[model samples]
Target: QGSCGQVDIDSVILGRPGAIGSWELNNFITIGLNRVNADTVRVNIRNTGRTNRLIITQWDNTVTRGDVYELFGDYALIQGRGSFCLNIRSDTGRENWRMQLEN
Candidate 1:
């Protein structure tokens, strides 16, 4: 086999790249959680306005936005211990981003 391969998996998509909120300058977005018992969730967050230093907080895990994030452990609470949410904000006076939530 070549260095390339494929990994098949099953997951339910919950959110897509859309209006984060009021869609105003210096805006922030809060994404809700997905269904329980999803094994794990993969989130893709990106900033489309420009090269920005965005803030993304999930379960107290903060980082810059530009790639995929995998949620597990107590962070990925299933059985509705309750649902979680992500906070996305921009430092500049403009906000433009897209997020994909999967479980």
Candidate 2:
């Protein structure tokens, strides 16, 4: 066999660029538990992208405290091919989660 081409996997470095613009939570649809301390709720997300495609995976009951639900399809799709924001809000506080995309 001839000399095989050197495959460089160790040298490959992955970097995540920040979001282009801010992401908003739009509004909430339903609330399962609304306690003064902790609560679980579901809402529709409005991303800052051209295509408004919403995708909500099934919530793991083991992870989630209260009732789990799915988001509507009106949410926007993440723009570009990098990290983006998934804005979520509740009675406690507001959170900005990061979502990454692969080419």
Candidate 3:
């Protein structure tokens, strides 16, 4: 069996309290090569309906061995109060992983 890792999302923009706006996310969630043994990894985002709906502009493609990369996207007009969930999964094993989220 292998081990899985955890990721935490730190918001870079919480949308102003009554103002409609947009936010840019330029952050990386380090997926250590030692932890992921999959030929490809999948990333996804979900809306929790806390404030407003979230719009994802981009995402990371498949990752292979000996590769290090960053995943990022832009959120457009996210409602005033909404939550989001970002997920990543690998297709292979030898699994050890770590992640960091940025707004």
Candidate 4:
């Protein structure tokens, strides 16, 4: 595998505090093509809760399909590439959250 072509997600919600959600994402574009050419990945969070937390972790560079990184804040940043695991905690009960991705 090389790089992820596209990974898109719209308005979504996360599990409660106890039952946190764990997600494993595939390859995404996180770096530039060469030294000059560069790519970007953006993630946006709509709502903010007291316990709202999002964690993104890179699995591996060899077996996995993308780059390796560890992210905690939900904001706009570099493009995501390759296999990754995501841990999310929204609130104590059912809640609403939104996320946007751009390449």
**Which ten-residue region of model 4 has the weakest summed lDDT?**
31-40
CA RMSD (A), model 2: 18.8
lDDT of 3 by residue, 8-96 (tens): 22121121222222222222121211212222222222323232222222222355635443333333323233233233333322122
Cα TM-score of candidate 2: 0.18
- Scored against the true structure, residue 91 in model 4 reaches a CA lDDT of 32
Residue pairs whose backbone atoms clash in candidate 4: 26-82, 27-82, 28-80, 28-81, 28-82, 29-80, 40-79, 41-78, 41-79, 66-82
lDDT for 76 in candidate 1 is 24
lDDT of 2 by residue, 1-103 (tens): 0010111111111111211222232332111111111222222223344443434322324355664533312333454322222222233122222222111
Q: How do all models score by TM-score?
A: 0.18, 0.18, 0.20, 0.22
What lDDT does candidate 1 reach at residue 69? 38
The 0-to-1 C-alpha lDDT of every candidate, in the order given, reads: 0.26, 0.25, 0.27, 0.28
Compose the digit string of candidate 1's lDDT tens values, residues 1-103: 0010111111122223332221121222222323222232333222223322222222222376554434322232122112233332222222222332222
Candidate topping lDDT: 4
Better of 1 and 4 by TM-score: 4
- Candidate 4 positional error at 90, Å: 28
Residue 80, model 2: Cα distance from true site in angstroms: 17
Work out how many backbone clashes candidate 3 has.
9
Report each candidate's C-alpha RMSD, comma-separated, in the order given.
17.3, 18.8, 14.6, 17.6
